[PDB]
Ligand binder design. Structure first.
Ligand code: FMN
Length: 144
């Protein structure tokens, strides 16, 4: 699966299609693949929960579940794992992408990887970056 132009955008993100069973990944950026160590072929058609592992806070995962079910945005931080089992902190932002009648068509997920739970200035700057990134991908996804 050769990268589309969308997938060559130099940010970590995935797009899922909630019409397909278990809301699977249909697009994943090259940066996301570099971060997580998976090939595109390995993760297309899978739900993103494969990134979770033993030290992932399950209460935080439920916050994400609730946002998806209520079709709203959420921003959380949680521990995720690469294919080889390397841990990273993920400052994660979810938002729905809506069509011209306001119905949700896709979900966008943006990941900012780090080595620690961030707070205060680092958190603020991280959230600035991931929200701007989500906006750019929302525009890009409009014509998919
Ligand atoms: C667009 C999108 C991106 C997601 N990205 C991540 C991610 O980076 N890390 C993660 O742990 N979960 C991610 N998730 C959340 C899981 O896919 C799943 O929704 C979560 O585990 C809650 O559902 P579950 O209880 O059925 O597992 C993402 C979900 C969506 C829709």
């Amino acid at each position: 699966f050769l990268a589309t132009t969308l997938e060559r955008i130099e940010k970590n993100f995935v797009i899922t299609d909630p019409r397909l069973p278990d809301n699977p990944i249909i697009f994943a950026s090259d940066s996301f693949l570099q971060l997580t160590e998976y090939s595109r072929e390995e993760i297309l058609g899978r739900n993103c929960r494969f990134l979770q592992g033993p030290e992932t806070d399950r209460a935080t995962v439920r916050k994400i579940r609730d946002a998806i079910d209520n079709q709203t945005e959420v921003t959380v931080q949680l521990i995720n794992y690469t294919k080889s089992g390397k841990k990273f902190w993920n400052l994660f932002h979810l938002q729905p992408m809506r069509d011209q009648k306001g119905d949700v068509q896709y979900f966008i997920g943006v990941q900012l990887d780090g080595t620690e739970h961030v707070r205060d200035a680092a958190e603020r700057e991280g959230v600035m970056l991931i929200k701007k990134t989500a906006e750019n991908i929302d525009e890009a996804a409009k014509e998919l």
